[PDB]
Amino acid sequence: KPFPLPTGYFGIPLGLAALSLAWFHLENLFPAARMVSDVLGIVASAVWILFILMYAYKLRYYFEEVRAEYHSPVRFSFIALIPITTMLVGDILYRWNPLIAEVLIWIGTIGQLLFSTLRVSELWQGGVFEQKSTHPSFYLPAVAANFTSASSLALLGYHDLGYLFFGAGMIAWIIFEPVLLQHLRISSLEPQFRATMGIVLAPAFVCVSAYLSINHGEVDTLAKILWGYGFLQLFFLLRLFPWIVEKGLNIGLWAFSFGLASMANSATAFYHGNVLQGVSIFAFVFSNVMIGLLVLMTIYKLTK
Amino acid sequence: KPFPLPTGYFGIPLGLAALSLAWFHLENLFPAARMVSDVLGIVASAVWILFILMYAYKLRYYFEEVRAEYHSPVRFSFIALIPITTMLVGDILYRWNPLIAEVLIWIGTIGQLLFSTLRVSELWQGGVFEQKSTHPSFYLPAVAANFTSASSLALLGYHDLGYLFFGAGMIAWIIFEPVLLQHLRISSLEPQFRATMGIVLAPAFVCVSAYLSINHGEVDTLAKILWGYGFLQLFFLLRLFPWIVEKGLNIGLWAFSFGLASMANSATAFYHGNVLQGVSIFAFVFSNVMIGLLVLMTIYKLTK
Amino acid sequence: KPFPLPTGYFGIPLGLAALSLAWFHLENLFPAARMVSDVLGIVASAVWILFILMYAYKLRYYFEEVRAEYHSPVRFSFIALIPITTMLVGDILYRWNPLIAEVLIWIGTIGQLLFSTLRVSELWQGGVFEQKSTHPSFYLPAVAANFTSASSLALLGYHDLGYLFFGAGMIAWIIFEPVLLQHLRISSLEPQFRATMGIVLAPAFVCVSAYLSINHGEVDTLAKILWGYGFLQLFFLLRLFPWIVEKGLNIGLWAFSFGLASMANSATAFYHGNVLQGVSIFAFVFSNVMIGLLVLMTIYKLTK
Ligand SMILES: CCCCCCCCO[C@@H]1O[C@H](CO)[C@@H](O)[C@H](O)[C@H]1O
Ligand SMILES: CCCCCCCCO[C@@H]1O[C@H](CO)[C@@H](O)[C@H](O)[C@H]1O
Ligand SMILES: CCCCCCCCO[C@@H]1O[C@H](CO)[C@@H](O)[C@H](O)[C@H]1O
Ligand SMILES: CCCCCCCCO[C@@H]1O[C@H](CO)[C@@H](O)[C@H](O)[C@H]1O
Ligand SMILES: CCCCCCCCO[C@@H]1O[C@H](CO)[C@@H](O)[C@H](O)[C@H]1O
Ligand SMILES: CCCCCCCCO[C@@H]1O[C@H](CO)[C@@H](O)[C@H](O)[C@H]1O
Ligand SMILES: CCCCCCCCO[C@@H]1O[C@H](CO)[C@@H](O)[C@H](O)[C@H]1O
Ligand SMILES: CCCCCCCCO[C@@H]1O[C@H](CO)[C@@H](O)[C@H](O)[C@H]1O
Ligand SMILES: CCCCCCCCO[C@@H]1O[C@H](CO)[C@@H](O)[C@H](O)[C@H]1O
Ligand SMILES: CCCCCCCCO[C@@H]1O[C@H](CO)[C@@H](O)[C@H](O)[C@H]1O
Ligand SMILES: CCCCCCCCO[C@@H]1O[C@H](CO)[C@@H](O)[C@H](O)[C@H]1O
Ligand SMILES: CCCCCCCCO[C@@H]1O[C@H](CO)[C@@H](O)[C@H](O)[C@H]1O
Ligand SMILES: CCCCCCCCO[C@@H]1O[C@H](CO)[C@@H](O)[C@H](O)[C@H]1O
Ligand SMILES: CCCCCCCCO[C@@H]1O[C@H](CO)[C@@H](O)[C@H](O)[C@H]1O
Ligand SMILES: CCCCCCCCO[C@@H]1O[C@H](CO)[C@@H](O)[C@H](O)[C@H]1O
Ligand SMILES: [Cl-]
Ligand SMILES: [Cl-]
Ligand SMILES: [Cl-]
Ligand SMILES: [Cl-]
Ligand SMILES: [Cl-]
Ligand SMILES: [Cl-]
Ligand code: NA
């Protein structure tokens, strides 16, 4: 029996793809990592293909559900997961076929830029977006899609292009988070949306990963500044975790994967640069354990 | 028959002065640019003189209109156009008389600092500024006046002073834009004010132009970050343009000139630094075509 | 007759400790400064000890007042003064006993991190913090505690750790000030709270002092950017001062000490780096005169 695939589900391959790329950067330090990087990679791409097929199905037979998602001042943001993961799969495929990889990366970059130009600017005409629309998911089209373009174009050798996209993501981040934290302080989020709190972890770590990708792994003052703020939000989120899962654990916690994987990626670069190697090992293992718990609970839900 | 000159009209020489200075930086790459730079320069200064005279007239015979502008939590910002363009005319005059140029630049810097100290701080006593007061024009006294002081003082050799003013402008920018974008998302702007959306283009490009002026044209990571965010807002604004001019074209679109000219200026520096030369040429030509359309429509309105 | 010590009173040794450390950095330029640095230092530590004892008393016999402070979405922030000054006293003691100094600095760092993880994140569950809770004092646990950890750990040789804490403070600063200034524009502050406006001066100068502490006194572009924004807020505050003390002078003005002392500290580094030496001397003297007026009025209040 057919069914419209919920767009949020792209968060699953996203996380897994990100984790692949983290292990991929351990290769020259520990060659066995390459094996791990391949397995995650293949799995992430399999799911991605399947999900793309399902979403194409949803575009033909449930198109009005997609349109309603697209016009919502909140739900549209999850549409951005599609180009994002498309770019990440591109990065994975680069290790085997740089030509398919570049095609995918350009599809994802052009698509996310076009999505945000169409929709996020249109938010500025007012009267649709409301105060209660201020959701962490807004980071996906505004910030994460940009950081992913930046690292992917860097992967292809377009470093200055990557810098333009990186600046767009970083300043969009700093421009949106103030009002998001203020809204969280005043109204916060209903249990149905609380799992979305995990995206709050993402901006600093995704930022630093894209920055280190474009600047050839140079762990400078900026990268440490970013890492400090990221660990601050990590601690806040750890303290908040009981409240976030107050109504029970659920697949929505895949929202943390993006931050967790990015932490692991950044950890790798901090480890090559010989900066805070102990914190790096801790971060790398902790994000891997957390994404492993997520995969275990997702298999338990699927097989039951 | 006398008439009080609307303060917004200083936007016209402002734009033209900025465009002059952009072409001025092409001189060592294409000497013919110097000719263009002179013509724009002279025209910008002519208008400036005329406008200053009119505004002096308005200060003597319509003073209460100026006072009402000054006390408004929205309209006061356009007063800042006067020192800003005063500084820009100073920069133009530097090519011929550095002494008049320095006098003008100090007048403009002291005047804008004194204006903002008097008025913007007073906003913090509450009860006059309202949520509906959150207008893009607030960037003029808070951000642009500062960036203009920074580049002008740099022009005079006061680089560290210029850096103080640059930091004031950049952090004021980052501190105000979050709530401005949130307000645009929720309420946006009535057609009477929509042309003011063009000032949203300005901060990143004016920032980067002032930064490159103070740092001797060094196109570094910061300048590329700024350029990326500026092009993001440019694209948003292009998408929004039909809505902005929904009630018809009008002289208010001169609000875009400041961003457009600044883009052209930054383009010049990016071209000397051999960074994204294709994007630079595109930006330079596009801003020149847009300001040319503005001059053509302003002549059509004046001669009809 | 016993009495619960008001937590805000830690602002007094804080300021004095900060001023000590400012003079301490003049030593190699003017050895007499070391004498001044010692006197302030000893006084700051005496008060600190006394205040700690009183607060321990308040914890045993007035515990419910402390708990009510802790649960308030506004008043909790002053609790952060305790670790902050604890760290500052640690820094002073370093000149004589590095072992006690390190113990104090770790107590203060662990304590402030734990305080903010417990309480500031909990703000994000909503419904307690209100729009009217947006107070400048929020900078203490969010921003200043972090900058103080950063400089203290640097003092101990943990420069990369210090950078993590510095980034947390700087991005927390930039993330909170937008909504604070917007709230000040719209509602501002009742006379009972107006003295708290002095904390608005603090972020940029405390930031730059921590940054120069961690980066070995290198006065670079960032430090000048910060100094420019700090002087902008200084001027705004000077203009606002009559309104701030509209209902009369009071001990609450010690809220300015933290910014003033930090200005003096930054001035020292700017003077060693040979950057804006005239502005540096002015800043150093002006903050010293202002904290001296504060000490004089506090003695007049105590002896009367
Ligand atoms: C579904 C994702 C694409 C599948 C392509 C798998 C290619 C198998 O790649 C394997 O790993 C090594 C290094 O990665 C390669 O050198 C070899 O091709 C093979 O050992
Ligand atoms: C990934 C989502 C892309 C599709 C987003 C849907 C946006 C289209 O929007 C809709 O398109 C219709 C076409 O008939 C028009 O009739 C409607 O006016 C318009 O609202
Ligand atoms: C949120 C904004 C943070 C920007 C961080 C900018 C830090 C770049 O600062 C650099 O650090 C080096 C220290 O090793 C110095 O040698 C360089 O002169 C300095 O430019
Ligand atoms: C990304 C989220 C971090 C992992 C969530 C761990 C759950 C934290 O809270 C849980 O309850 C108690 C602590 O509160 C402890 O008994 C458990 O260790 C922990 O599982
Ligand atoms: C990345 C975070 C999701 C992976 C699983 C984290 C573990 C959550 O485990 C937590 O343990 C508690 C008992 O200690 C339970 O009461 C909570 O419901 C449960 O969330
Ligand atoms: C109204 C603005 C001031 C007018 C001064 C015009 C000076 C004419 O300047 C012209 O351009 C050359 C380079 O710019 C100069 O070397 C020469 O003076 C002349 O060729
Ligand atoms: C460029 C605009 C500068 C002028 C701004 C007007 C600010 C003066 O403000 C007005 O000045 C009057 C002087 O009689 C006083 O009576 C009023 O109290 C005061 O509101
Ligand atoms: C919004 C804040 C962005 C600040 C950008 C800071 C970037 C300065 O970063 C500099 O980039 C160079 C790469 O060429 C490195 O060699 C330097 O070590 C590094 O300090
Ligand atoms: C700074 C503003 C950018 C220039 C405004 C160009 C007007 C964009 O929209 C106009 O309508 C249609 C596109 O929507 C096209 O037919 C036209 O090319 C264009 O003139
Ligand atoms: C800098 C932007 C102002 C200069 C003029 C931009 C051109 C705007 O041209 C646009 O073309 C459309 C038809 O294509 C018309 O419907 C719009 O009313 C008109 O704004
Ligand atoms: C209450 C704070 C601790 C008191 C310790 C005071 C130690 C007195 O220190 C004095 O200053 C000199 C440099 O500072 C030291 O070399 C000498 O110990 C002494 O001259
Ligand atoms: C420096 C301030 C530290 C103390 C903050 C008080 C936070 C404790 O909080 C209180 O503790 C009580 C313990 O009996 C509990 O019964 C209450 O549920 C709880 O609100
Ligand atoms: C608010 C964010 C401001 C960040 C300031 C970053 C400035 C670092 O910029 C540095 O300045 C030097 C100029 O001496 C250049 O030589 C370096 O290449 C450049 O990286
Ligand atoms: C940190 C606060 C700065 C010092 C406060 C100085 C008081 C400013 O205002 C006071 O009133 C008049 C100016 O308005 C003048 O007569 C006085 O010089 C000044 O004392
Ligand atoms: C750091 C700021 C506090 C130290 C004292 C600053 C001096 C404030 O002096 C001011 O002078 C005015 C008269 O000129 C009085 O009317 C004000 O009440 C008084 O605040
Ligand atoms: Cl579930
Ligand atoms: Cl470590
Ligand atoms: Cl018109
Ligand atoms: Cl190019
Ligand atoms: Cl008092
Ligand atoms: Cl100086
Ligand atoms: Na707000």
Residue numbers in the entry:
A (entry chain A), B (entry chain A), C (entry chain A): 5 to 308
Paper text:
The helium path was used for collection of anomalous diffraction data at 5 keV for two proteins: thaumatin and the membrane protein TehA. Although anomalous signals from each individual crystal are very weak, robust anomalous signals are obtained from data assembled from micrometre-sized crystals. The thaumatin structure was determined from 15 microcrystals and the TehA structure from 18 microcrystals. These results demonstrate the usefulness of a helium environment in support of native-SAD phasing at 5 keV.
TehA is an uncharacterized candidate for an ion channel as it is a bacterial homolog of the plant nitrate/chloride channel SLAC1. TehA consists of 314 residues, including 1 cysteine and 10 me­thio­nines. The calculated Bijvoet difference ratio is 1.8% at 5 keV. To remove statistically incompatible crystals, we performed crystal rejection. After rejection of 5 crystals out of 23, the 18-crystal dataset showed excellent CC1/2 and R split values, indicating high data quality [Figs. 4(a) and 4(b)]. BUCCANEER was able to build 300 out of 314 residues automatically. The refined structure has an R/R free of 0.17/0.22, indicating high map quality [Fig. 5(c)]. The f″ values of peaks 9 and 10 were very close to the calculated f″ values of Cl− and Zn2+ at 5 keV. The anomalous peaks 9 and 10 are coordinated by a nearby nitro­gen atom of the main chain or a Lys residue within a 3.2 Å distance [Figs. 7(a) and 7(b)], revealing that the two peaks should come from Cl− but not Zn2+. Interestingly, Na+ is located on the threefold axis of the TehA trimer, suggesting that Na+ may possibly be involved in TehA function.
